[PDB]
């Protein structure tokens, strides 16, 4: 789906609870040129461009969400799996108008489960910054204003092998807002050059 032979994303949701509301969701394939988006993330201090050339190009993905912003615990869940036992490092960078405003580094060790190696991060507190961002966003009176604010906002996520530092996955996230009758949606694209 979204990943490599070495690491597969199986689940991802961002949500709010009081039986829950998913802002965005991936459950479990066209291409895009990293060129079109180079200016959206950190300029050169280890951006989509420093990263992309260092390889390996098959690891880079673009994900466009159409978030459901009509609706408590603010959480994110993710689940990866692999056939090799690793400890994963996950750098997340939140970028607003190109400026990196947040960097988060997390770690997760493989748990063996049903012949596979599973990496789970279930109901982790959503970042301070995105929660507050969400509360300002929901008050805009028109979807096209939400999209205007969001066209300046991206998240770049880099998952590496912690004990080798091989890059396993690098995802760039861009966002729009869906309406009510259509809920969340995404499209996973592949970053080429
Ligand atoms: O896998 C993770 N850690 C991990 C730890 C060890 C090993 C592997 C992985 N994660 C934690 C960090 N993550 C995010 O902060 C994040 C990324 C994309 C969307 C998002 O929320 C969407 C909320 C807003 C966005 C703006 C308006 C619309 C809704 C949050 C991603 C998941």
Numbering used by the authors: 222 to 239, 247 to 256, 266 to 308, 325 to 446
From the manuscript:
The TEA domain (TEAD) transcription factor forms a transcription co-activation complex with the key downstream effector of the Hippo pathway, YAP/TAZ. TEAD-YAP controls the expression of Hippo-responsive genes involved in cell proliferation, development, and tumorigenesis. We previously reported that the mammalian TEAD transcription factors (TEAD1–4) possess auto-palmitoylation activities and contain an evolutionarily conserved palmitate-binding pocket (PBP), which allows small-molecule modulation.
Overall, TM2 binds to the same PBP in TEAD2 where palmitic acid (PLM) and other inhibitors target. The (2-cyclohexylethoxy)phenyl moiety of TM2 is surrounded by several hydrophobic residues, such as F233, L383, L390, F406, I408, Y426, and F428, enabling strong hydrophobic interactions, which is very similar to the interaction mode of TEAD with the fatty acyl chain of palmitic acid. Unlike palmitic acid with its head group pointing toward residue C380, the urea moiety of TM2 exhibits a completely different orientation and sticks into a new side pocket, which has never been reported before to be involved in TEAD inhibitor binding and is only accessible by rearranging the side chains upon TM2 binding. TM2 binding drives significant conformational changes in the side chains of residues C343 and L374, which makes space for TM2 insertion. Additionally, TM2 binding causes the side-chain movement in residues Q410 and Y333, which reduces the distance between the nitrogen atom of Q410 and the oxygen atom of Y333 from 4.9 Å to 2.7 Å to allow the formation of favorite electrostatic interaction. The surface electrostatics of the TM2 binding pocket also illustrated that the (2-cyclohexylethoxy)phenyl moiety inserts into a nearly neutral environment, while the urea is buried in a pocket bearing electronegative properties. It showed that all eight interacting residues in the new side pocket of TEAD2 were highly conserved among all the TEAD family members. Consistent with previously reported results, MGH-CP1, VT105, or K975 adopts almost the same binding mode as PLM and fits very well with the PBP.
